[PDB]
Known about the structure:
This is part of a larger assembly, with 1 copy of chain A and 2 copies of chain B.
Chain A: H1 2-12, H2 22-33, H3 37-45, E1 51-53, H4 61-64, E2 72-74, E3 80-82, E4 88-91, E5 97-101, H5 111-128, H6 137-147, H7 154-158, H8 172-177, H9 180-184
Chain B: H1 12-17, E1 19-24, E2 27-32, H2 35-39, H3 62-67, E3 89-100, E4 108-112, E5 123-128, H4 140-143, E6 152-162, E7 175-179, E8 183-188, E9 203-205, E10 213-214, H5 230-239, E11 241-246, E12 252-256, E13 263-270, H6 271-281, E14 282-287, E15 295-300, H7 307-310, H8 317-324, E16 335-336, E17 339-340, E18 344-348, H9 350-361, E19 382-387, E20 390-392, E21 398-401, H10 403-408, E22 422-423, E23 433-440, E24 448-449, E25 460-462, E26 468-470, E27 489-496, E28 518-524
Parallel strand pairs in B: 14-19
Antiparallel strand pairs in B: 1-2, 3-6, 4-5, 5-11, 6-9, 6-10, 7-8, 7-11, 12-13, 14-15, 16-17, 18-19, 20-21, 22-26, 23-24, 23-27, 25-26, 27-28
Amino acid sequence: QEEHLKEIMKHIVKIEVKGEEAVKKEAAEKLLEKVPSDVLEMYKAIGGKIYIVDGDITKHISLEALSEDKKKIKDIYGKDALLHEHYVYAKEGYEPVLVIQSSEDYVENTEKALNVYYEIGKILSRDILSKINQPYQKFLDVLNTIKNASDSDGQDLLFTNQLKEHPTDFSVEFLEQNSNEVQEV
Amino acid sequence: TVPDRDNDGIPDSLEVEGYTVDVKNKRTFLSPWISNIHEKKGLTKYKSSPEKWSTASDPYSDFEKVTGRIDKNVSPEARHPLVAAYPIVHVDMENIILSKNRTISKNTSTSRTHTSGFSNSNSSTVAIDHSLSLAGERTWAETMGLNTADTARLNANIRYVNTGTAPIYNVLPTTSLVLGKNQTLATIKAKENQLSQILAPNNYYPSKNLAPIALNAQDDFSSTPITMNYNQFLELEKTKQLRLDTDQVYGNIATYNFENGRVRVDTGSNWSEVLPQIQETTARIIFNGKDLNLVERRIAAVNPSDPLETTKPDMTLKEALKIAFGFNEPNGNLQYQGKDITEFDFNFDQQTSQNIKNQLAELNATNIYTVLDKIKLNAKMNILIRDKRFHYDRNNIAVGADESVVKEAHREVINSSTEGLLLNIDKDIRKILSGYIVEIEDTEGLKEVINDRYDMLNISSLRQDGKTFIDFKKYNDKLPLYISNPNYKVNVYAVTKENTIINPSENGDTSTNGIKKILIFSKKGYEI
Amino acid sequence: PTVPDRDNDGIPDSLEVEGYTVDVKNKRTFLSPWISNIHEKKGLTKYKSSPEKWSTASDPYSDFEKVTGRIDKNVSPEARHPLVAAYPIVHVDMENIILSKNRTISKNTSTSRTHTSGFSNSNSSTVAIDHSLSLAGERTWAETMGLNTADTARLNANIRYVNTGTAPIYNVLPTTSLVLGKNQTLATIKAKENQLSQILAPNNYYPSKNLAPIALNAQDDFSSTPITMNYNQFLELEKTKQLRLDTDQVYGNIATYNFENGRVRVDTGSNWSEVLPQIQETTARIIFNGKDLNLVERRIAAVNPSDPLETTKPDMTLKEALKIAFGFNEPNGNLQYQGKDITEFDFNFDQQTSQNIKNQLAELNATNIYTVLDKIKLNAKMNILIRDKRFHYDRNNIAVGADESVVKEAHREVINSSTEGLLLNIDKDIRKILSGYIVEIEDTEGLKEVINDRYDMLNISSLRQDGKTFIDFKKYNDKLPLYISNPNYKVNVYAVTKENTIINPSENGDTSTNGIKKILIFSKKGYEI
C-alpha cells in the first residue's frame, strides 16, 4: 500500500514551476532530439534552417509572400485541413525552409509529434536524397514485396488511392515519371 | 519506457487520444488509432481516462473491458469503456388467484414503470386482466362469497427479469408488494441459498422452461401471508392495478483473475457499494424505442467541479446514442433501423433543462435536432427520449395514440371472410389496443353491437404465424355471422387502453355507449 | 532529490505550508505550487494545509484525496476542501401519527431539527402536531377518542431519516428514543437489524420520497402496543402537542479509497464511532440558518495554542471560513450571501467563545465586529451561531415569528383579488412563520364580522402547484361564496404568526380570536375587489 503512493505521487507533484515560456522552448528541443543527428547536419549543409514561430503560422514574413495558392494540405491520414488552423508547414525551393509552431504539448500527446516527424521525412526524401536520387531499386524492391502479399493491410497503411490501382508490379520507369507518390510512401 | 499513472495496462498517451485492439492473425495487441486502416475493418474508436482504473466506475478495468478478459456475460454493448455495466432487477407478475380465507383466476401483464423529480430506484406495475372469461361472473364480490367481515387470500406467481447489463450471482432482491398509496400488503421473502442460478442480462429466473416461483411458500411461515380485510378489496376493485417496489441489494461481484483466467466471485466486493458511485458520476438515458419497454443505460460524463473527474473524455449527445444503443449513420442521418432521430421527443428534468437552455444559447439555435452533435453532456443529467407518435400516461407507459396512425396500420387486409380478419400488423402497435367493438348497420342507419358489454371486448387472438385473427364466436353465442342485407354496412371499432372503461358506470351501465370508439373497418355486406 | 515529506501524505512539506493547487492539464492532472499571477485569472482556489497531519480535518480522508477527487464520490462538494471536516449528521423526521385505544385520530405533523442553548454535541429534533380541526364535529380530542381515566392509547407513527451532514453512512442505522414532556420516555424505536443496506448521501432521505415511510409500530408480534401510555401522559400531550426525538451517534463503518484498483470498499475495521470524538475536540463549530431557515452545521479546523501538533494547522480567519464553508462571495468586496449582506445576520457566542472574542476585539481597538471581520482568529472549540436578524426565535432556536413591518412588506404585491380568494406570490421563506389568517367583514359604519370565528379553524391557506398561494374562503365557510352587504364595505384580513398563536382553548374554553395580537394584512372596499 505504501509502495503505490510513490509512483502516483511523483507523476503528479511537479516540484518547481519551469515558467510560462520556458516550457515552450524545452518542448520543441526535446522533440527534435529523437531524430538522428546526422539528418540535421544534412539539412544545414543544403542550406536553409528551421525556425520556430509562436503565433498563427499562416502569417509570417518568410511564408506570407510565397505559395498563397497552396492553402490545401493533407495530413498524414489524408484528410484535408486549412493551413491557418494547421500547426506546421514546409516549403521546397531555392531556400529550403521548415517552420514549426511552438506548443507545450509535444511530449505529452503524440498526434502532434507525428506530423512534425512526418514533415522531416518529406524534406529528407524530396529535398535531400533527391540531390543524389538515393531512393532506388532497394527501396523499390521492398516496395514491390508489399504490393504482392497475402491480404496485407500494409498497403492500406502506406499507399494512397493512386497506387492501389496499378495492376502489375512496380517498374523502374514509373518512379522516374512519377516521383511525388513514391517519395510520400 | 511509457508512463502509465492509472496502472491499468494501457499507457497514458493511448488512453487520452484514442486506441483500439485488433487481432493480428492469432495474437491480440493494443494499437494507436489509425484513421484509414482500422475504420474500414469495422473497429470502434475508444477513449478513456488516464487516471481512472475504470472510467465508468464499474468493477471492470478499462483494459479488461475492451480486450474481452471479463465475465463473458456482460452484454456486448457494455463492453465499451464509457457505458456503466450494472444489474437492474425488476419483478414481473404473470397471474394471480383469489379466494376466501369461487376463485377469480385472471392473467396479468406487467411493465417496468417510471414516473415524474424522478429517482434512481426500480419499480414495476402490474395490470390485471379485466375481461370476463365467464359470462355469468358479473361482480367478483359475489362470485367469491365475500362478506363484510370476511378476508381474501392472495396467491400469485412471479419471475425475475434482468434488463441491465451485468450478472448477479448469489443474492436475489427483496421486494415488497403495495396496493394503493401506502397499504403494504406483503413483503416477498428473500429466499435463502436458493438463487444458485445466474441472471444474465435479458434473461429470466426461473427460466421460461420452468414453473414460475409460487409466491406463497406453501409451508407454515404464514397461514395466509397475504391476508386482506374487506375495505382493501373494495379499493382494489375500483383501481384494478398494483405496484411492485424492489430495492437494489444484489449479491457479490464476479471478477477476472489474471493468473489463470478463472472468474471467481470475490466475497469482499458487493454491488451495494459500487452503485452509489455510478449513480453520481454518469448521465442517465431512457429509451423506449426497441419494443416500447423502458431501457436504461448510463454513460460516463465529465463533472466540471471535480479535478479527477474532468479527466474523462467529453461525450456529445450524438456520440452517446451511437455507442449505447446502436444508432448509426448510413447517410450521416441518425436513425435506429430506419426511423430517423426526428421521430422522437426529448424531455428533461428541471436541472438538466436549465443546463441545456444555456447550451442552446451559446450556439444560437432553436431546433436541437440540428446542433445535436454540439451538445455537451455533464454529470447527473437525466434524459428521456420517447417516440413522439404515441400517447403516454402518468407513469410514462405507452397507453394510446392518435387515431390517424392507427388506421394506416390496418389498411392492409390480408384476408376477410364472414368469420374474421387475419391481418399482419407491425408488432409494436398491438400494445396499445385493448379490444374491438363489432357492430352491424341497418340499410337505414341503425346500429347493432354484437358484444355489447364493457367487459366483453377480448375477442382478438393471435395466430401462430403472427397473423392477428379476430374471433366472433368467442364472446358470441357460438354461432356464425348473419347479415340482413348485402347492402348493409359492417362497421368494426377498436378501443385503445387509454380510452377504455374498467368498471360499470354511475348507474351500472354495461353498454359501450359512452365509450369513445375509433372506426377501423367498414366493408359492404356482399364483399364479406 | 528525496523531497521531504514527514506526514507521508503525498504532498511535500513546503507545498502544504505555503499554498498549492491542483489543475487539470488537458487530460492529465498535476499538482503545482501556487503562482499568484497566472492562477488567479483561472478561478482556482488556493489551498493550504498541515505538513504534519495525514488529515488536517482529522476525518478519514487524507489531504491529498480531498483536493484531487480520489474519494467517495458522495462526499458533498463543500467538504472537498481540506479544512472542512466531512462526517455524518443523522436526525429523524416524523411525518404523521395516528392514535386509538388498545375513530382513529390521524393528524399530519411537521418537524424541524432543533438546537437549544450551553449547547452540546448531540442531535435532536422536535415535532409539532397540527392543531387545526380537520373535522368540524371533532371538538375536544378527549372525546373523539374514547379515552377513560383507566384506559391506554396506542401510538402508531411513520418516520423518515434525514442526513444533513456531509458524508455517507453505510451499514447500521442509529437508535433513537422518543420522549414526551421533560423526562417521560415513552419508547425507544428498535434498531432494525441488517436492513439499512442502502446509503444515505448528504441531503437525501431513507427511505426515499418515492416509497412508503418506515412504519414506527412494527405491525408484527414484538409488542402488542409498544407505545403504552397511562392517562396522565395523554393529558400533557393534550396541553403541549410536543414530542422530542433524541438520537445517538452510533453510525456504521467508513468507505475508503483503494489505490490499487480505484475501488471504494467498506472496511470493517474503521468505524465512525471512533473518529467523531477527534473532530469534535479540534474544530470550530459554525451553525447557520441562512438558506431555508434550517440549521446547517459545519466544522472548520482551527489552531489550539496548548498543543504543539495543533499549532501546525494553517491559521483560519473567520471571513475566509464563511467563504469556503457555505458559499459566501465578494461581488464588490462586501461579504454577502445571495444579495443579503453579511450585516443582516446576528452573531451569538457561547460564554467561553464570547469571552475569547472580547479579548480579540481589545487588541485591535474596534467595537463593530462587522468591520474587523477579516482579523478574527478562530481557535479550536469555539461555537458560533449565525441567525437571520429579522425573524423572532424561540428557546430552541427555531424560527417562530417576525416584526410586523416585515410581515406587511411581504404582502405589498397583490397579484389578484376577487370574491373567491387571493392568489399571491410570496417569498418561500416567510410562509414558515405564518400560522393562518383571520377573515372579517366591516360594515360601512365600523362593525366587524369575523367569518372563521373559532380558535381551531385557521388552516385555510393552501398552496398551488405553481407556488402561488391561494386562500380559499369556502373551506371553513359553508361551502358558499363570499357575500358583501355593501360594495363600499372594507374587507380586512389579519395574519397570525405561530408565536402569537393559541394551542388550546382558554380557561373558560374560549374559542374566539379576541386576546390574540393580530396584524392587519389587507383592506379593500367592497367595490375594489
